[PDB]
Symmetry: C3
Subunit: 218 residues, 3 copies
């Protein structure tokens, strides 16, 4: 009937008004979307995450803090001795220098203990060794010799670094070597030195200011 | 015959159709949100952002340019002397080595003026020094001694580094050293060297081709 | 006719119910958007991108892989000699030591060919050189002289680095040098050494353990 038409039409009109409120406008939705970033070619400002672990090796983003930490973490290890270390035999007898203090990059399996460099991660590395061999007490030898090498007792692989010799050991010489040396993970690496001197009497060669540190390079 | 009721029925239909036309559909929005938008925990593509300043340490995202700039900024100074310099006194007198040219990284306060380096950023640094001492004129000494240490301004600190002693300075000796040191922002650092030599006569020990460069580690 | 209105109302209802089912509903839309990543205040649990090429310098985001590679990529090159070679002339003869093995970083044009380092990329590089000159057999010369300098192909720049001298060179002297050098793109660079010895007889001079390597510092 007449009144019937009124009622049913008013009912669906109410639904139309409910749809109006419950739904989103073209312009409003477009504005909200423009507020966000497109998946491709996304551009943003003042965007930040939580820094992933330094050891992280994935496609995840790195934060400025992350690069700060990483670059500083290429130092690998560092060890030094303050004072003098005796030499047992001046006849090309391999001996391992000691270190009262040492430091190591953390989070890579590296550890320095008992004057040992644990190679936490293998790869290419840069090694810089500087020490001083000197004689104190007695007559300085008429001839001196001291080779510098990255030796390893048991394997004896002595990467020859340098051989400084001179007949004025009474005041000591400083050996300096820098070069590229590769290493494999889990290796217990230590510094070996051999000294040979002829002549003199009551003389004992002395090793001091021993610097031993590495650098990580892939 | 019904009249106004059917015309309002039809009027409602018009508004209803316009309502649908000016709205946001499910299918439409889903496509924008999934294949053409970024989520949280998203997987992204090769997009771009703004380059953060090197000075920052926040968790903002780093760009390849930022990595380049930060890794290249890890030198922080390099001083070089061209020519020659004479040794003032051969009595282990604390002598401040002088420099002709220097360069420092920007954005950290590092400075190399008056032959003294300023610590722009307090922290650990790797310092390398290469000095050359030669005897010119007179008779070569029967004893030549040169001590190298990291002089701190206002103290003449004897941070002993190297002492090369040989009695053949007739042509020239080059002393080089590399090692790790720590410093704090605001500490004025210049290379003080003590040189002593005995024997000979009317000779002149000349310091030349001095290099004093420090590369930051940590 | 009520059937008339009923069929037209059924048409209205068809549109109504279709547009109701197929539409984006506000609460759900807001939920999804909140799940999405805001462009300005972007803070995401994690996110990944294709590892951009190491050479990239745009404002594209950096990956942990990229950070590792670039630092590892900053080695520039390396050159090493295995075995011993004889020094041809002790007469200040400009001689370029040859190399048996050498590696370069990829993706920069760097190449080490003909025992000469081609500067793939211009910039500031830290150069590391280690050479040993030793006299073998017969009478060691009464004096020795060996200049170490970075000769430059095409230009003839024998950058005086260090000079190795001794009166008993029968055991070798390794005056390894380190410092900061600048180079322009495409420059072909080698290393030249001039050796002069005085006195002695029936002695052969040997060059051994030649390491030549640099790293692209800032």
């Amino acid at each position: 009937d007449l009144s019937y038409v009124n009622t049913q039409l008013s009912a669906d009109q109410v639904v139309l008004d409910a749809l109006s409120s419950g739904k989103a406008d073209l312009s409003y939705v477009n504005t909200q979307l423009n507020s966000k970033a497109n998946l491709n070619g996304a551009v943003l400002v003042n965007a930040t995450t939580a820094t992933p672990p330094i050891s992280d090796n994935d496609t995840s983003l790195a934060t400025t803090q992350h690069v700060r930490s990483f670059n500083h973490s290429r130092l690998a290890f560092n060890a030094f001795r303050g004072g003098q270390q005796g030499v047992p035999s001046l006849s090309y007898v391999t001996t391992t220098a000691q270190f009262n203090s040492s430091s190591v990059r953390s989070g890579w399996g590296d550890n320095f203990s008992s004057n040992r460099w644990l190679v936490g991660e293998g790869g290419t590395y840069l090694i810089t060794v500087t020490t001083r061999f000197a004689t104190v007490g007695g007559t300085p030898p008429t001839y001196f010799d001291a080779l510098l090498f990255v030796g390893l007792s048991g394997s004896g692989v002595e990467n020859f670094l340098t051989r400084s010799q001179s007949v004025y050991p009474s005041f000591g010489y400083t050996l300096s070597w820098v070069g590229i040396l590769t290493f494999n993970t889990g290796q217990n690496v230590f510094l070996n030195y051999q000294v040979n001197a002829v002549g003199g009497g009551s003389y004992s060669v002395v090793l001091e200011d021993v610097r031993f540190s590495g650098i990580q390079l892939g």
